[model samples]
Target: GNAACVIGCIGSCVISEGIGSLVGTAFXLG
Candidate 1:
């Protein structure tokens, strides 16, 4: 599953639930 990804200041946002759908889907190029 290793592939291209992203890096953002949102590292501070420790919201586990949101991150799973937020950033995860946010950068989802597929």
Candidate 2:
């Protein structure tokens, strides 16, 4: 995903996704 998301974008994305069903998916994703 670094091709698009990179490290900083991924970090900021974690907080937005942290409160959604995406939260679980996000953790599993990483």
The per-prediction CA RMSD against the true structure, in angstroms, equals 6.2, 6.4
- TM per model? 0.18, 0.21
Model 1 local distance difference test score = 0.41
Candidate No. with top lDDT: 2
Which run of 10 residues does model 2 get worst, by summed lDDT?
Answer: 20-29
Candidate 1 lDDT, 1-30, residue by residue in tens: 123433432442343446454555344343
**Per-prediction tally of clashes:** 0, 0
Q: What is the C-alpha lDDT of each candidate?
A: 0.41, 0.46
* Residue 20 in candidate 1, Cα distance off native in Å: 4.8
Candidate 2 residue spans exceeding 4 A from truth: 1-7, 18-30
Worst 10-residue lDDT window for candidate 1 reads 1-10
